[PDB]
Structures are given as structure tokens and as C-alpha cells.
Design a binder for this molecule. Structure first.
Ligand code: ATP
Ligand code: ATP
Ligand code: ATP
Ligand code: ADP
Ligand code: MG
Ligand code: MG
Ligand code: MG
Lengths: 427, 534, 29, 38
């Protein structure tokens, strides 16, 4: 008995299809054909992604799928012990049953699955992390020797999870030890819709959710939201619609009469959206509320032409492929509104990813810190489908002062390079 | 019969293109031990009892360990992994390391100068032999173990019936004395496989599939072998496994449930399509391939707008031909110059590609955003040092003026100039070649700093300078046609034009965003205003 | 920067017991 | 280590004392039968 719906993990169909294709495909036909090919099954998986995308659910569901013995677990650094020569002894312990069964049946064993959490806690680069001892430059060697080397093993499958894929030891990622290196990424709008649908199913089945609420609005408004964020929004909405019946006064009370008419409203969803849940990726509306403090009035025609040109440029950077990269420069006298006519164009573009890199959040930084911050804000814009970035008050980023003249060279060079670097294909 | 077993195919076992390695191994060692002992003593000498094999991760080292033991006509080998010979109770580690050299001492006493060689295999010889005075807060087990092994293998006590072979990925943590002549001398490295060896590696792994006729005749081994470059044996095995897996899945079906296609997979033959897809999106090398560069610098191909786009290619081809077949001049350089927005960084990659030199690279500033001058110098020096290990090469430094950090107020620039002006005269080691092509947009500045008399020649890249060429370029791009091109021709005639070829792929696009009635006027207005004058 | 700190490990010695009990008890009986 | 060592020392002490006392007692009684037998 099994069903892709039952597990309840939505928004990663391609991911699961690929994992199934390359990890559990050789184990399904009658042994005859697979034996006739002389192929060794793949043994290893590594998953990584920014926090909240759904890694620990995939491992749990894969573990619960198999009709095998229960899987083991190692919660990060739970194998380090004082007495010299006990960490190596412990790590060597997790493979005993698989070894014995391989010796006992042979080519007919039942999958042994090992689930590592936070693989970055123990297995790190050799030579570095050298503060003292060496119990860290030995566990890695023990694991490397065990996974493959002396002796033949074909009845294991190690799964690893981590959020920093740039520290793992290189030897532990060569085809043979950890071959499949997939990647979990933030969902797109359809994924958000699937998540919201899954997490609300049990309520609609009991007529506990008023028909007023519309899922499509919730999906659209939520931007750069992750799975954890969607679950938290639903939980908070429940809690706010849920507190009304309680009477928070001395000698805590609760009404048992009206409680049967408990209902949830879209207004509660909105309240929780604008009071208690705030995503990381993107820019929150509180940002745009701090650069157009006093709206946009019409003092003549020279406040309409600029908006029209902005519309033309935004439209071209979405439907043409000879030129993936565009730029524009707003110029005028001082004190004229060139930071509230540059935020209203970005706001009215409805692009997925929007950012603002201003000079007031880096008071006192030196040159290198500014370069690093600019590099990060630009790199985060290379990992979407189409994005816009605003660099306001250039002449303050590279310090300018008419005496001299004086200014910074490194920042100017970084800027002159970053305005000609095309992003990866199709972005 | 002394040591060598009868079967010495070395392809039956499974090893690939390692012929030279083992021939050298025998020439340097394992040779005297199959010779007249009379002659041995007549020259008078002792034998050698150590080897350390150091190669990049996953390069067949482990297989050699389990296969050398088989081919030797002797007792057997023993494989002792490094992280196993430590124990909690005090003194156990020394006793364990002692046991590994016992039966050879017993045989040297009971059969002094008689019997066979003893083989002990130290796998992960980096785990235990790190150093003697580099740890801290660690009893002393490591130092004691290394001292015990070092004294036992080499010391007053004499042993003559042993061969230690150690294996490691990173040799930069191994201890000093061990690599010092006497214990584990005559080191060896196992490099990446060559073009020929890749064919043998593929053949060894694909024999079983071909035996039962499961491989389509369409697939060609030679095509794949030439296609796959900078690969390791592990990667080739992975490619084969992934091709098998894509067919594996091509037959099965069901995402709601999982079931086989009613054993319909009568032959489940693998076709070249599967290999192509797998090589595309599944297996990727560790070295890295210069493909994204080659397909990102040349973004829209190289159209022909006249003669000035042929002369340059011909001159580049002549320079390549000269560097290929000359002996008086091993090093040749050239500089490309022209006004900005004229397609110089896509007329220097094409020339590099036309020549099929084995080693091609392109150093551009985009990989050093935020680097101080020291790091820039280090990276450029590394690139050239890598270029110094082949019988041919071609290195391209593009946008020089952005490497020197130039800004014309004072002016101000950076060590980088001296490094670049010394690297451009150093001839390479005897019997090799090289070729440096540089791109820049400001000739006069490079003349000032005394760099233009170090390059050997300069070629000129012009921009569109006559109406007819503009019309031809528009015709070949194919955007404005019919009466529109007629009216553009009528309006353009006269007054010449000074528009670069990267500035003519932005004007057309900014023009095609209005309604059809106003496109021509907008394009003409933009050209008239921006067109400027020479 | 000069402040460098350290962690440490320990060992044991162990002794012999398990069947001496039988001999002593048999003597007493 | 501590618990087992304490167990061992306690049991060893009690057993040794019992055996010693019993041996001395047998030593002292044997002479009476010896003299009576004379
Ligand atoms: N039509 C308009 N265009 C621009 N700003 C407007 C308009 N109508 C009102 N404003 C107000 O102008 C203010 C924004 O001025 P802003 O601070 O951007 O000027 P500025 O050029 O950035 O000054 P400085 O360059 O010295 O920082 C806000 O209060 C905004 O509401
Ligand atoms: N030259 C070769 N001939 C045959 N198979 C090879 C060769 N090189 C690699 N392989 C294949 O790759 C694997 C051998 O890799 P091996 O175990 O030798 O790496 P390793 O020395 O353990 O790596 P590391 O030193 O990083 O631990 C086997 O699956 C083998 O079939
Ligand atoms: N015949 C051609 N010659 C050059 N470029 C062409 C030609 N035909 C089409 N192109 C397109 O125009 C581009 C030329 O501009 P390129 O990207 O090389 O800028 P560039 O010369 O480096 O400018 P700059 O030196 O100012 O950075 C090519 O990359 C390609 O996309
Ligand atoms: N695709 C998804 N479908 C349903 N819930 C999801 C999904 N992705 C994440 N979640 C939710 O995220 C939480 C688990 O997050 P977790 O996987 O532990 O995050 P991380 O990957 O950072 O460890 C649960 O509340 C789970 O319901
Ligand atoms: Mg401003
Ligand atoms: Mg190994
Ligand atoms: Mg350039």
C-alpha cells in the first residue's frame, strides 16, 4: 500500500521523479536482467538548500516508504566521545548488520538505510578545523574507508542533509560514495498553491473553514514565502480566529456555548499576514513605505513621461532575448524626487524578486565590506527568473568630496565590472 | 617461478591504461628479486622495501592494491586501514602496530636470507602518520605509534623480506622521515587517464553488456571517448551506470504506484540518445570544461558586415600558423585595439577556437570582483604556470585596462603592471610553445606606460563607417524588411555613420517596442541623435 | 589573538576479574 | 570502575576474613582430639 498523495509533500515533483529514477530504478525488475548487466547500485544522496525548503520531510518520507527494517538516525555530532578510540568504534558500529547479512544471504539482502542530519557537523575538510586533538581528522578517514574500499558492500544507502555545500570534503563526493547531489530550492507560485492546499485539507472536511476565504488571493499575495512560512501563516490565522471565544480576565475562562460556531475568516489571514509573519527573501512592503513617504502627486507633465519610459524599459527586459541585461540612469538637480520615482517604477513591475541597495545601512564600513555587501546583493539576484535592483545615491557609495578630488577605487571598479556581467542562461 | 604468476594479461584483471606505470614499477623495483643471487652479491647491494602511490581522488589506487596481491605467487597480502590501530586501553596501539612485522622477523631468524617477500598494505597512510610535534591535548599515542613504526621499519634491527606499500589522497600531511630515503622511497603518482586509456576503460566496463547483446549497434565507443575529456575512471563508470539507469526508467512507469511494464523489456536496448542526455545533465567532470566561456563570449555568432571582419581572422590564422611551425621564435604575442563597442572580446575567442590547441584558457576580470592587487597577481601567475605544462597553448587576457585598475583622474592605477610586463617576455621551457592575445580599448595609455613596444604586432578592429554596410548588416540580421528598408535606405544616404556593432543590437531592440506605425521614425531618431560624429 | 585554548582526552588501565569469585566461593563452601 | 571495584574489595575482605577465622578455629580444635587419642 502506497500513494504519492498520502505522503503529503507538494511542490517537488521533478525532484522526486529524478531521485526515483536514479536511486530506486535498478531494484525493481526480476534480478535476472539487472544481474546480466553487471552494474553496481548507487549508494548515496546529498540534499542541500536554504532553510525552510523541505529537506527533513523528504528523508522522513523516503524512510517511511521502504518495506525494510526501520532506518537508523544520527543527529549530527552524536558520535564523538572522550575515551580515545571510541568515536571510530561507534561510527564503525552502524554497518554491522549490513555486513553480516551480506555474508549470510548474498545478493539477496534487504536495504539498510542510514539517515544523517547536519552532515557538516562531523565530516569537514581535512587539514583545516585543526584547533587540537585530531579526532576530527580521523573520523573522516574511517568513514571514507568504510563506505567503499576493502570488502564489497551493495546493500546500504546513506542520505545526507546540509545547508552549507561548500565545506564537505571533496573525496566524499566523487561518483561512488555520494553520487546524487540534488538541490531543493524555493517554490514558485504553483508550489505555494500546492502547499496551501495540502495544509488546509483537514479543515475543509469538517466545514470548519468559512467559504469566504479564497486560496488564489493567499497564493498571489504571499511572495518569497517558503513552506515553513506558509505553515506558520496558517497556524497563526487559526490561533487568531481561535482566541475570540476565550475571555482573558482574572480566573481564566472559556465559553462552551458559542464554541461550536467556530469559523475562520479571510480578515484573520490578512491580520496574520501584516502582523506576525514576515519572510526573509524579497522586500517587505514596510520598505516601500519608507521611500515614498508622501505619495506621488501630479505637478505637470514631467511626472508622467518618466513613468511611461520606465514602463517601456521594464516591458523590453521581459520579452526580448538578444539583450538579457539592461540599465538606466536617473539624473537631475538635487532635492527633486529621484528616489521616489525610482521606487514606484520598481514597485509597479510585479517582478518576483526586488531589492534596494542603499548607502544608509552601511554606515562606517571600509571598502572591502562595501564590496562584499554589493556582491552578495547582486548574487542573490542571479538565482531567480527575472529581477530588478536599485542602486540609489551612487556618489555616496564611492565617497566623493570636491576637494582633492578624493574617492574609493575598489568600489568604482566593482561597479564598472558588475554592469557588464550577463547572468546565467535564460535569466 | 619465483614471484610472477603465469597469468600476466593485466586486462583480464580490470586495470585500464596503466601500462607505463607498472613497467616503471618493475624497472625500479621487483627486478633484482628475480635475478642470479650470485650476481646480486657480486655487485653487492640490498633490496628496496617501500612505495607510496599518490593520485587524485578516485583514480584506481584501491584496485591496484587488491589486484597486486592476486598476481603475486606468494602467501597473501594484509590490508590494515589507518583508523583501526588505535585502542582505548593503554599500550594496545603499540602492540597492534608491532604484530604487523612479526612473521617476517621469525622467517629471517629461522630461514635467514631465505624464504619470500612479505607484503603489508597500509591503506589511509595519512590517518596515523601526520607528525610528531603538531598535535596538542592528545595523550601521545600518535607520536609513539609513528616512532615505533619508523624504528621498526628502519633501525639497528635488520629486515630483508618485506615490502610496505602505502596509499593516500593528500600527500601533504604525511610525515617527513617516511618520505625521506630509506623507508618509503621511490614514490609514484597515478595521473588522469589519456585519450587512448579512456577507450580501454570503456571497453573493460562494457564487455558484459555486449556479451548478451543489450547494446545498440548505433552507439560508438570512439565517439564517446573523444567526446569525454578530463574524466576519471569513476566518472566513466558513472556515465555507463547513468545510461543504464535512464533506460531502466524508460521502461518502468507509475508515480501513483510502482510496477514494471509487464516484463515488456525484452531487450531494453540503450541508444545514443540516452548516452547524450546522461553526459549532458547527469555526469560532470571534476577538472571543469571551458564551455560556458566559449558559449557566453560569443553570444550571437559572427555575422559578416564586410571585409573588416575577414582580414582580422586571416591575420589571426597566420599568427597561429607561425607559432605552430617555427623554432627561432617560441613565443608570439599580438594586441587587438579599437574603439569601445566594436566586438573585440568576441573576435578574440573565435580566433582561439579556430586553432585546435590542446590547452586554451581565457582570463577576464569577472572572476576577481573585489580582489586586492596581490590576489590578482597570484591568479594570473597560476594561470600562466598551468599554461607551462603542455606542448602548445593559447592564453587570452581581455580588457587589459580593467586589470590595471585605471581611472583617468590623476591618473591612478596599480604590481599588476610589472607582473604583466615581465610575464610577456619569459620564454617557456625548451621545446614548447605559447601564444598570448590581448584586447584593449585605449591605445594611447598603453603606449604611455611603455607596454606597446613589448607586443609584437597590433591589428585594428573598425566599426561600421558607411551606409551600405549598415544596410547589409540590417539585411543579414533580418528585422526591418520590405518598404521599411527602402525608406531607411533613402533617409540614411549621406552624412555617413559611426555606430559600433554592439550598439546596433540595442537600438533595434529599443525600437521594436512601439506600435508598427512608429518603429521606423523612432529608430531613425535614435540613430540621428546618438550616431554622433567621428 | 594570543589566547589559544585546548580540549583533551583520557585513557584507562583495567584489571582482571570474573572467575576468581568461583574459586573463593568454592574454597569457602 | 568505582562500583565494581568497591564490590570486589568488600566481597574479598569479607570472604578472606571468614576463611581466616574458620582456619584458625579448625587449627585450635584439632589438638583436643590429638591429646584424647594419645
Ligand atoms: N511627483 C513626485 N515626484 C517625486 N517625489 C514626489 C512627488 N510628489 C511628492 N513627492 C515626494 O517627494 C519626496 C521624495 O523626495 P526625495 O527624497 O526622493 O528627493 P531626492 O532627490 O532623493 O533628494 P536627495 O537626492 O537630496 O536625497 C517624498 O516625500 C515624496 O512623496
Ligand atoms: N583504471 C581503472 N580501471 C578500472 N576501473 C577503474 C579505474 N579507475 C577507476 N576505476 C573504477 O573506479 C573505482 C576505483 O576507484 P578506487 O576505489 O580505486 O578509488 P580510491 O583510490 O579508493 O579513491 P581515494 O584514493 O579517493 O579513496 C571502481 O569502481 C573502478 O571500477
Ligand atoms: N561580426 C560580429 N562581430 C562582433 N560581434 C558580433 C558580430 N555579430 C554579432 N555580434 C554580437 O556582438 C557582440 C560583440 O560585442 P561584445 O560582446 O564582444 O562587446 P565588447 O567588444 O567586449 O565591448 P567592450 O569591449 O566595450 O566590452 C558579440 O558578442 C555578439 O553577440
Ligand atoms: N513541500 C512541502 N510540503 C509540505 N510541507 C512542507 C513542504 N516543505 C516544507 N514543509 C513544511 O516545513 C516543515 C519542515 O521543514 P524542514 O524540512 O524541517 O526544513 P529544513 O529543510 O530547513 O530542515 C513542516 O512544517 C512541513 O510541513
Ligand atoms: Mg537620493
Ligand atoms: Mg582508498
Ligand atoms: Mg572587453
Amino acid at each position: 500500500d502506497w500513494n504519492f498523495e498520502k505522503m503529503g509533500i507538494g511542490g517537488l515533483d521533478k525532484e522526486f521523479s529524478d531521485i526515483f529514477r536514479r536511486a530506486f530504478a535498478s531494484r525493481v525488475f526480476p534480478p535476472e536482467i539487472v544481474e546480466q548487466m553487471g552494474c553496481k547500485h548507487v549508494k548515496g544522496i546529498l540534499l542541500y538548500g536554504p532553510p525552510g525548503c523541505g529537506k527533513t520531510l523528504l528523508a522522513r518520507q523516503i524512510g517511511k516508504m521502504l518495506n525494510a527494517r526501520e532506518p537508523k538516525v544520527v543527529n549530527g555530532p552524536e558520535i564523538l566521545n572522550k575515551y580515545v578510540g571510541e568515536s571510530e568504534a561507534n561510527i564503525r558500529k552502524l554497518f554491522a548488520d549490513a555486513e553480516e547479512e551480506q555474508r549470510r544471504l548474498g545478493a539477496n539482502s534487504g536495504l539498510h538505510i542510514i539517515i544523517f542530519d547536519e552532515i557538516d557537523a562531523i565530516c569537514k575538510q581535512r587539514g583545516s578545523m585543526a584547533g587540537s586533538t585530531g579526532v576530527h581528522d580521523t573520523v573522516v578517514n574511517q568513514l571514507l574507508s568504510k563506505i567503499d574500499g576493502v570488502e564489497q558492500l551493495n546493500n546500504i544507502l546513506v542520505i545526507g542533509m546540509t545547508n552549507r555545500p561548500d565545506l564537505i570534503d571533496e573525496a566524499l563526493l566523487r561518483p561512488g560514495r555520494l553520487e546524487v547531489k540534488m538541490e531543493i530550492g524555493l517554490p514558485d507560485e504553483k508550489g505555494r498553491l500546492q502547499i496551501l492546499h495540502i495544509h488546509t485539507a483537514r479543515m475543509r472536511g469538517h466545514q470548519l473553514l468559512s467559504a469566504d476565504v479564497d486560496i488564489k488571493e493567499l497564493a498571489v499575495e504571499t511572495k518569497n514565502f517558503s513552506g515553513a512560512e506558509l505553515e506558520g501563516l496558517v497556524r497563526a490565522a487559526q490561533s487568531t480566529a481561535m482566541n475570540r471565544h476565550i475571555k482573558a480576565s482574572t480566573k481564566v475562562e472559556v465559553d462552551m456555548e458559542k464554541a461550536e460556531s467556530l469559523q475562520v475568516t479571510r480578515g484573520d489571514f490578512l491580520a496574520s499576514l501584516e502582523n506576525d509573519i514576515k519572510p526573509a527573501f524579497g522586500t517587505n512592503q514596510e520598505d516601500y513605505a519608507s521611500y515614498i513617504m508622501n505619495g506621488i502627486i501630479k505637478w505637470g507633465d514631467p511626472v508622467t513621461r518618466v513613468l511611461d519610459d520606465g514602463e517601456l524599459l521594464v516591458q523590453q527586459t521581459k520579452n526580448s532575448d538578444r539583450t538579457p541585461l539592461v540599465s538606466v540612469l536617473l539624473e537631475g538637480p538635487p532635492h527633486s524626487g529621484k528616489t521616489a520615482l525610482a521606487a514606484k517604477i520598481a514597485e509597479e513591475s510585479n517582478f518576483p524578486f526586488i531589492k534596494i541597495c542603499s548607502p544608509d545601512k552601511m554606515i562606517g564600513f571600509s571598502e572591502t565590506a562595501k564590496c562584499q555587501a554589493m556582491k552578495k546583493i547582486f548574487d542573490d539576484a542571479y538565482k531567480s527568473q527575472l529581477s530588478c535592483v536599485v542602486v540609489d545615491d551612487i556618489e555616496r557609495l564611492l565617497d566623493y568630496v570636491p576637494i582633492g578630488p578624493r574617492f574609493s577605487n575598489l568600489v568604482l571598479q566593482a561597479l564598472l565590472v558588475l554592469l557588464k556581467k550577463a547572468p546565467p542562461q535564460g535569466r | 617461478q619465483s614471484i610472477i604468476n603465469p597469468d600476466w594479461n593485466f586486462e583480464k584483471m580490470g586495470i585500464g591504461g596503466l601500462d607505463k606505470e607498472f613497467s616503471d614499477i618493475f624497472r625500479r623495483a621487483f627486478a633484482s628479486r628475480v635475478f642470479p643471487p650470485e650476481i646480486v652479491e657480486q655487485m653487492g647491494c640490498k633490496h628496496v622495501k617501500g612505495i607510496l602511490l599518490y593520485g587524485p581522488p578516485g583514480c584506481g589506487k584501491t584496485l591496484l592494491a587488491r589486484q597486486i596481491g592476486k598476481m603475486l605467487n606468494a602467501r597473501e597480502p594484509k590490508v590494515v586501514n589507518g583508523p583501526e590501530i588505535l585502542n582505548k586501553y593503554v599500550g594496545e596501539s603499540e602492540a597492534n602496530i608491532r604484530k604487523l612485522f612479526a612473521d617476517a622477523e621469525e622467517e629471517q631468524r629461522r630461514l635467514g636470507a631465505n624464504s619470500g617477500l612479505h607484503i603489508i598494505i597500509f591503506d589511509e597512510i595519512d590517518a596515523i602518520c601526520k607528525q610528531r610535534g603538531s598535535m596538542a591535548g592528545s595523550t601521545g599515542v600518535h607520536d609513539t605509534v609513528v616512532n615505533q613504526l619508523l624504528s621498526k621499519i628502519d633501525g639497528v634491527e635488520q629486515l630483508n623480506n618485506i615490502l610496505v606499500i602505502g596509499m593516500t589522497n593528500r600527500p601533504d600531511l604525511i610525515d617527513e622521515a617516511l618520505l625521506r630515503p630509506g623507508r618509503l622511497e621511490v614514490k609514484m603518482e597515478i595521473g588522469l587517464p589519456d585519450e587512448k586509456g579512456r577507450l580501454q576503460i570503456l571497453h573493460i566496463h562494457t564487455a558484459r553488456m555486449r556479451g548478451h547483446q543489450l547494446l545498440s549497434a548505433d552507439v560508438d565507443i570512439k565517439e564517446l571517448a573523444v567526446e569525454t575529456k578530463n574524466f576519471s575512471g569513476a566518472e566513466l563508470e558513472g556515465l555507463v551506470r547513468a545510461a543504464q539507469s535512464t533506460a531502466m526508467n524508460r521502461h518502468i512507469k507509475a508515480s501513483t504506484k510502482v510496477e514494471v511494464d509487464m516484463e515488456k523489456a525484452e531487450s531494453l536496448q540503450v541508444t545514443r540518445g540516452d548516452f547524450l542526455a546522461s553526459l549532458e545533465n547527469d555526469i560532470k567532470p571534476a577538472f571543469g570544461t571551458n564551455q560556458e566561456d566559449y558559449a557566453s563570449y560569443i553570444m550571437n555568432g559572427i555575422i559578416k558586415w564586410g571585409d573588416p571582419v575577414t582580414r582580422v581572422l586571416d591575420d589571426g590564422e597566420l599568427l597561429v600558423q607561425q607559432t605552430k611551425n617555427s623554432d627561432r621564435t617560441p613565443l608570439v604575442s599580438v594586441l587587438l585595439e579599437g574603439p569601445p563597442h566594436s566586438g573585440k572580446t568576441a573576435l578574440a575567442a573565435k580566433i582561439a577556437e579556430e586553432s585546435n590547441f590542446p590547452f586554451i584558457k581565457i582570463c577576464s576580470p569577472d572572476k576577481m570582483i573585489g580582489f586586492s592587487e596581490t590576489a590578482k597577481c597570484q591568479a594570473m601567475k597560476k594561470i600562466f604556470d598551468d599554461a607551462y605544462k603542455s606542448q602548445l597553448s593559447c592564453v587570452v587576457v581581455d580588457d587589459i585596462e580593467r586589470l590595471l585598475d585605471y581611472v583617468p583622474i590623476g591618473p591612478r592605477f596599480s604590481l599588476v603592471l610589472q607582473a604583466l610586463l615581465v610575464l610577456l617576455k619569459k620564454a617557456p621551457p625548451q621545446g614548447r610553445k605559447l601564444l598570448i592575445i590581448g584586447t584593449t580599448s585605449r591605445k594611447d595609455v598603453l603606449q604611455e606606460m611603455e607596454m606597446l613596444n613589448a607586443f609584437s604586432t597590433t591589428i585594428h578592429v573598425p566599426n561600421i563607417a558607411t551606409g551600405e554596410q549598415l544596410l547589409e548588416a540590417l539585411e543579414l540580421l533580418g528585422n526591418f524588411k520590405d518598404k521599411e528598408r527602402t525608406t531607411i535606405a533613402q533617409q540614411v544616404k549621406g552624412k555617413k555613420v559611426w555606430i559600433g556593432i554592439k550598439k546596433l543590437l540595442m537600438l533595434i531592440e529599443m525600437s521594436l517596442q512601439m506600435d508598427p506605425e512608429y518603429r521606423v521614425r523612432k529608430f531613425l531618431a535614435l540613430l540621428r541623435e546618438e550616431g554622433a560624429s567621428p | 589573538s594570543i589566547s589559544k585554548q585546548a580540549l583533551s582526552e583520557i585513557e584507562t588501565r583495567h584489571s582482571e576479574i570474573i572467575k576468581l569469585e568461583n574459586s573463593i566461593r568454592e574454597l569457602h563452601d | 570502575l568505582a562500583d565494581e571495584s568497591l564490590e570486589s574489595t568488600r566481597r574479598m575482605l569479607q570472604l578472606v576474613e571468614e576463611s581466616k577465622d574458620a582456619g584458625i578455629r579448625t587449627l585450635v580444635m584439632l589438638d583436643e582430639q590429638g591429646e584424647q587419642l594419645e
